[PDB]
Each structure stands twice: as structure tokens, then as C-alpha cells.
Amino acid sequence: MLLGTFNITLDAKNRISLPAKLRAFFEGSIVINRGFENCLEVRKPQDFQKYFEQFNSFPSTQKDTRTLKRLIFANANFVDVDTAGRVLIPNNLINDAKLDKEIVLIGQFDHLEIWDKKLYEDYLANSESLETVAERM
Amino acid sequence: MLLGTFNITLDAKNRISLPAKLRAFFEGSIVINRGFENCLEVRKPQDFQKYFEQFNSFPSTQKDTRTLKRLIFANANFVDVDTAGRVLIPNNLINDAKLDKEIVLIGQFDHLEIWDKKLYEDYLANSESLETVAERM
Amino acid sequence: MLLGTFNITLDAKNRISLPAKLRAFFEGSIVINRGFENCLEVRKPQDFQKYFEQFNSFPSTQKDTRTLKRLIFANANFVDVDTAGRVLIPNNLINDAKLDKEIVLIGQFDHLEIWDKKLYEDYLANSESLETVAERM
Amino acid sequence: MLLGTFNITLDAKNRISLPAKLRAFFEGSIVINRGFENCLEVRKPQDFQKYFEQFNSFPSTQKDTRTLKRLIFANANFVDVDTAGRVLIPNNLINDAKLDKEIVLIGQFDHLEIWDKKLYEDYLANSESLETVAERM
Amino acid sequence: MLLGTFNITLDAKNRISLPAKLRAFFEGSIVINRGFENCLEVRKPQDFQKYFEQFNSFPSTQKDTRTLKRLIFANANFVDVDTAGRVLIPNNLINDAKLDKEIVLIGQFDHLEIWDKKLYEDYLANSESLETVAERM
Amino acid sequence: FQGHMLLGTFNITLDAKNRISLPAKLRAFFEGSIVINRGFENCLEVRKPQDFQKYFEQFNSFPSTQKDTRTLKRLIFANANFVDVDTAGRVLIPNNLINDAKLDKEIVLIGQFDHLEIWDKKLYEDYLANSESLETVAERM
Amino acid sequence: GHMLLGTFNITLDAKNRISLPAKLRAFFEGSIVINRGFENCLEVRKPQDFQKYFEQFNSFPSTQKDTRTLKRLIFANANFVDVDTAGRVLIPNNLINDAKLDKEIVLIGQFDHLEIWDKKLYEDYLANSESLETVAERM
Amino acid sequence: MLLGTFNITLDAKNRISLPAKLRAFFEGSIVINRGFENCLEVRKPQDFQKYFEQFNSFPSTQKDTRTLKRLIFANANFVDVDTAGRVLIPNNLINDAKLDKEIVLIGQFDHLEIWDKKLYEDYLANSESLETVAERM
């Protein structure tokens, strides 16, 4: 399981070092792809595989289903975690999430989310209460 | 099955001593995270695991689902219960729930909720009848 | 199966002697918690376990679901039935149901309900017909 | 299966003799409780067991469900069928259904219904057609 | 499977001779009960057992369900088919269906229906088309 | 597979004795006896007993406490019959049935996979004459 | 040889036979079932597959007027034909007329079955009929 | 698992060279067919098989289902991937997608999509946000 918030820094080669606590969870490689609200998601391949199936339960004959699948999977990537537990983030992905220097990794149980510290805080700053949001589920 | 109410105190080092009755239930570590109505939830890891699944059953393509999951899992933590049955409560969590000194532990079968004594009493003070509430389920 | 009505007395030490017919059903200990309409329910732990699950099928993201779970499980207790088949009723529970002296135990198949004789009679006094109530189910 | 109509008499000691055809069906004891329209139902414990479960499928958080369950099970009883195939009918039940002298036992497959002859005839005298009632199922 | 239409006679002792084609299907005894539209239904006990179950899927807490069950099972009877394959129809049932002399047995796959010839012809004379009726299923 | 599928149209004749000769292709499918009963739009359906058995069950899924279900069941099963196919593969059609469908001389048997339908030639052509398009009817399913 | 795909232009000879495209011949064993399709086309299936297609119908009322018209219009016209050694199929006359078959056929694979079309009718079908996207959106 | 974006060229003989990463996934042959928004899909035959089944869950008695199936499968093609990992794209398909020189292969987990670079870039240029689209699923 993946939980918690971590504050790390994007190094000069666009890599991120997995927090050791987290590094355990991930084997030799991960699938990265772009998330919602400008964040980049990280997953073990096995989990990436199961996330995807949750999509195939979507029409596909529906225009939006295709836009969604296109925006997600054409940007997913497969990266290897190096011995030091670092992940080189793809160029395009570094841009999609406005990554720069100062990353926040948040555990999402299933996956990891990589954010730009300022964007993440803004996200948190806006966005309603845990109670307000939950009542609507 | 965690049941009952317990009055306890947050010590100087922000630790809480599990009620012995309750300490049995909890093995070496637990997951903590913030709950609803400002309370902090405690769970055996495997129970936290099952709680999460109950979420994945939520859209995810929905904005609210994401806000909910981010609000919850970003603040979950994994704490070790020490030999004496004490748990050091993370600072951020100490603030989320206005924890101070004088905590209330309530069993919730599934998990534990840690409350500020005043807040919890006010919560009970407000909030309708067991019957009024049940009729709406 | 727990069936029937039994008139008993709350002794000096706040204990209740299980009717022997009923004592059988219950092994070494029971869970007690407060019921609806001021009554205190009694169950075999295994049965309390099954009763709880029937709750987990409730939202949880819903405010009312939490109120309900909090009002119920924070007052559940786990009591041991002594050799003479007596159960010491927790103070808080003795107060919730206006227990005093002169109890009524009614079998509810699944559980047992402990009433204040007066309250129970009034409850029966009010409350519509078996047919009137069944027609609405 | 319990079928048919039987005219019998409530003896002086409030006992009823099972019609022999019927006595077969019932082993050593039965559960008795009050029925709808003032009648008293009789069942093999095993069957009473199954009947109850059909209730557990009812809210319980609903006020009516609790009234229904209290009205029914608080009056259920467990009686032993004597060697001569007689069942002593509890006093309270003798009153609920205006039992007196002259009973009617009607098989309901699942259970037996004990009626006051006059009340039953009046029930039949009123009540719509088999077709009219069926069309509404 | 019982099929066909058969013209038979009610003998002076209120007996009917099962059609030989039909008698085979029916072992030593049958359950009889009153049908819909004044007809009397006949079934092998096993089949009656399965027909009943289809009812237990009806509320029971509903007044009409009870009237239906009562009207049906209070008149069900269990009759032995004699060696010559005859069935002595109970008095009450002879009157319910206005049985006189001149019966009509119709196969209903599941059961057999005993009708008064005239009543049946009238039933057929009224009642809409096979298509009209089917369209509404 | 021809022993498992009744397909096709066959023009045949109702002989003097009210018998129909099963087309040989079809006769294979049916064993020694069949169930006959009246169909919809005046046609008479034919089935292998075990198939008739499965058809019926599909009915038990209907209320029964419902008046229309009973009328349906009565109109169908009171007129079902069980007929033995003779050695020459002929089936004697019950009188009542012969009348229900206006059978006379000049029958049409159409394969309906599950069962066979016997029609009066004129009636069948008229049925076909009316009735909408394959497309129009399917759009409504 | 597992799924039928593609478009094929072929000819209906004077004896009313069509030659299965070889690619498609594999897929079909000794015989096929033919029947009339929608939009005037004639469908072809291995019998096992025809069997499976029918079941999908039994999931339809039957007590419903339309269900009967549909079944009558389809199965009364199905036919069981043998694919000769050269891989040809002799199309039943009645079917030849239902689809306005003449000379110049189009076979399109439909995974499950094959559809035999009149070249002109098929082109027109295609000329009309909306976009892949427009149609999909409505599923 | 097909992921990513790849820029490639349609050679003179209308062939495309599978990116090596991708060539692994695909065995000896693929099925091609035309996709939505003018793109051509590619799949291992087994996957093509599974994608089709997802269609059979559509009416068939519905005019649109037939159009959709006709438009798709009448243009599917089965192509062999040569030793050098090249696929000869059917002329008709080359025209459907306005393929020319300069293709973009995007992974779609399930299949591959072949696009004309300009068309693909325009598609992306228009088309709403990842979030906006997801919200509607």
C-alpha cells in the first residue's frame, strides 16, 4: 500500500528519487502517464493493467471515451526505477504537470501522484471540504 | 470489533495511549488519516486496505471523487504503536482535528476515531436522534 | 432463536439475570449497545459482528451514516455473563434506557432487547396495529 | 406440507389437539406467536427460523420494521406438543385471537393458522374474490 | 406435462375418472384446491410443493397476500386417486366450481383444471384473443 | 445440425384423413411423437416433446396470479395434443386444431428453428402480405 | 480463418452460384445456412454460428407480436446449403430475389457472418448512411 | 500493453515499421480496420476477437448497430507483419485515414492507432481538457 505526502526535488536530469518507504512498493519499473488536475500518476505495471480495464467498461463508441483514452494512454510511459530508486520523468510529462523543481508525491493507495508544490497547494487551497465533497458521492 | 468510548489525554509528546482493551486489536502499526467532522481515524493496516477498496468503487473520472481521495489519502500516515501501546500522532493531524489535551476515542467497529473532547461533545449536542437519523438511511 | 417476553429486575449492582431459557443461547459474553426507542440490545458477539456488516452497506460518505454509526457503536460494550447467568449493565447504558428496577427482556430472534417496564408498556400502548404496520413494509 | 381446514375445540385447559393428519408434520415442539387479522400462527421451529430471516431483509433502521418485529417476536412462544398431540396455547395468545371454544385450523403450507370460528367466517364473509385479490399481486 | 381438453362426467358419488392419458402422470394421490374463475386445480403433491413456493415470494406483510394464501390453501385438500384412477372431489370444492355433472378437464402442463362444462364454454366465449392477451404479457 | 434446426418453408397438402406428411428433411428432427397446440395468428405449432417442455417453462416465468396469464395458459395448453408421427412420417392433425387454423387443403410448414408452424396457405400469404418490413419490425425489438 | 473480415467483389454466375473468396472458404466447412438479412442482403453463417445467432433471439418475448413477425421473416427464409468442392454456393432462388441479386455481388465480412449484397444496392447503402462517429455516438 | 506516441513514416510501398518496442507485442500478423476520427486501428487477432464481442452486445435488430458493424468489419484486413517488423497498409485504409508520409502511432493499451500527423495534431488541438472530458464519462 501507498500512503502519505512527501516533499522532494526534481533533479537536474529530470529525475525524482522515490522516498524509500515508497520505493519498496515499486519493483524495477513503473508506468507513468498524465493524471487529472495536472499531476502525473505512477503505478506498478500490474496495477496500471487493472486501472485500464476499469476504462474498457466505457462505451468506446462514445466520442468522449476515445478522447479520454487518447489523452491518457498516448502519454503513458513505462520507466525503469534505477538502483538509487530514481525515476527519470519523460520530457512531455514534465511539461504536462508544470514540473520544475519542488515536487510533492502523494500516495493514493493504488498509485502515486507527482505534483508541482505550488499547484498542489493551490489545489488544496481551493477544493471544498472533505465533508462537502463526500456528501455528493 | 472496536466498541465504546474512552476518555484519554494527549501527552506532551503528542502521544495517545491505546485503552489496553483496544490495544489488543491493534498489532504493531496502524494507519491514521483524517476523518469526517474533524476527527482522525485509526485502522489496522489490513482494515485500511479494505476501507480504500470501498472507494475505488467511485468514478474517479469525477472531480469530487478525486477531491475526496486526495483529502483522505494525502493525510493518511502509518504510525507504529509502541511497546506501551502509545501512538505518536502526526503534527498535521493534531491540527486538523483540534487536538490539544483531552481526547475521546470511540470504537467504530471498523476503526477508531480520535476526537477533541469539546468538539465531540458539541457534535453529539447537535446532531439529531438515533431514530431521526436512522429513518433516513 | 431468542423469543418471548420476560419480566425481571435490575439488582443492586446493576445486573440482570438471564432467564435460563435465554442464558443457553448466550455463551460466555455478549455485546450490549443502545437500541432504538430507548432499549439496549443484547447479542452474541458473532451476531453483533453480522449486525455491523449490515451497516457497512450504508454510504459512510453520508453524514447521517456516520451519526448512526457513532451513536450506536460508541455505546456498544462487550460484557461477560457470569456463572449465575448475570450481565452487569454499563452505567451509561443503564441511563440511556431509563433502567431503574423492573426490566423487560423481549426476544427479537437475532438479539435481545432490555426495556424499562413502563417505557415498554407505553411503547406498546402507542404504536399502531400489527396489520397497519405491516401494510407499509 | 400443511393443507386444509379443521374444526376443533379449545378444551378447558386451553389446549388444542392437532388433527393427527397435521400432528405428523410437527415433531416435538412448535413456535406459536400472533398472526395477522387476529389469528396465531403455528410453525416447526426450523420453519419459524426461515420465516424470521425473511424479515431481516427489512430495514431495521425503519421505525415500522421495529414495530412489526416487536409485535411479532415478543409474542412468539415455543410450546411442546404433548404425546396426545395437544398444544397448550399461551394465555396472552388465547386473548389476542379471541379464542374461546370452537377453533378453526387452516393449513398455510408453511404454517398453521388458529382461528376463532366466528372471526374466521366473518373474515371469509368479507374479503374479496380470489381473482380480485390475485390480480393485485 | 399435462395437456389437452377432456369431456367427462361427475358420477353420483362426486367422483371423476382421470383420462387414463392423464392418470399415468398422477401417482397415488393429488392435491386439489380451488382455482381461479371457478375451476378447481389438480396437482401431484410435488408440483403443489413447487407452486406454493412461488407464493412465498409474496410479501405476507401485505393484506392481499394473506387473503390470497388463505383463500387458496384453506381449501386445498389431498385426495387419493383410487385404483380405477378416480378422484372423489371434496364437497366444498364441488360447490366452489359449480360442478354438477358434465366436467371438463384441461391440461395446464403444471396442473389440471376441473371445470363445469358450461362455465368453461362461457369463459372461453368471453375472454379475448390469444394474441390480444399475449400482447399484454 | 438439420436434426437440430427447423428452417425453411414447405408447401404441402392436408390429405383426406387430415394428415400431413413431414417433409423428410423435417421428419429427421422429430422422433416418434410431437406436441401440437395452437399458435399465434392462426397457425398451430409443432414441437419435439422435450422442446415443448422448455417452451412451457418460459411461461411459468409469468405471474399466474394475473388474469391474462391464466387466459394465455388456458388458450394454449388446453389445445396442445401429443400426436405420434406414423411410419410414413405423417401426423394426424386433431379436428379442433384443423379448425382453429383454417386448415383445408394446401398447408405451409415454416421452420422456426425451435418449432414448426402449420399454416393455411392463403392465411399465411395474407399474413405476409400485411406485416411490415424486416427492418421496421426489428427496430422495435 | 477464424473471423470473417473484408469486402470482396464477386459475380453471381448464370446458375446462381457464387464462389467463396478462398480467404473466406477456409472459415466455412461443408455447409452454411443462408437466410435473408437487413437492408436486403442475405447473411451467411457456419451452422454452429447460425445456432448461436438464433439463441440471441429466444431472449425476445415471443408473446410479442413483433417478435413473431421477426422470427417468421427470418427463419422461414433460412436455408442450409452445401459449399461445393470448388467452394461455390448455390443461392436459393427466393433469396436471389429478396436481395436484388443479379450479377455483380459484394461480400463483406461481418466477423460472425458474411453478407451478400447487390453491388449497386450496397454502394447506395454506403452513399447514404451517416458517419462512423455519428452512428457510434448513438449506441 | 501498448502505450506511447511514436512518429514514423509511411515508406514508398505503403508500409509502416513497428517501433521495435511495439513489434514485440505483435506476433506474426495483425488485423487493421478503420478507427474513429480517421485513424486506422491495429490489433493482435486475439484482441480483435475480444473487441468484436463487445459489439455483439449491441441490438443487431437496430439499424445503427448494423451500420456500425458494416462500416467497421467490411474494412478490417488481417495483414502480416514482415520480418523487419513492417506492415503493408491496405490502399483503401491508406485513403480512409488521409495517410501520406508522416504517421503517428499511439498506443491505446488494447490496440494501436495509426494517424496522419497533421490530422492527429489537429485532433489534439481541438478536443477538450482531460478533466472536462472525464467529467462527462
Swiss-Prot record, chain G:
Keywords: Cytoplasm, DNA-binding, Repeat, Transcription, Transcription regulation. Pfam families: MraZ. Gene3D superfamilies: Transcriptional regulator MraZ domain. InterPro entries: MraZ, MraZ_C, MraZ_dom, MraZ_sf, SpoVT-AbrB_dom, SpoVT-AbrB_sf. One of its GO terms (molecular function) is DNA-binding transcription factor activity. SUPFAM superfamilies: AbrB/MazE/MraZ-like. Signal peptide: none annotated. GO terms for biological process: negative regulation of DNA-templated transcription initiation. One of its GO terms (cellular component) is cytoplasm. Homooctamer. Forms a ring. NCBIfam families: division/cell wall cluster transcriptional repressor MraZ (TIGR00242). This is Transcriptional regulator MraZ.
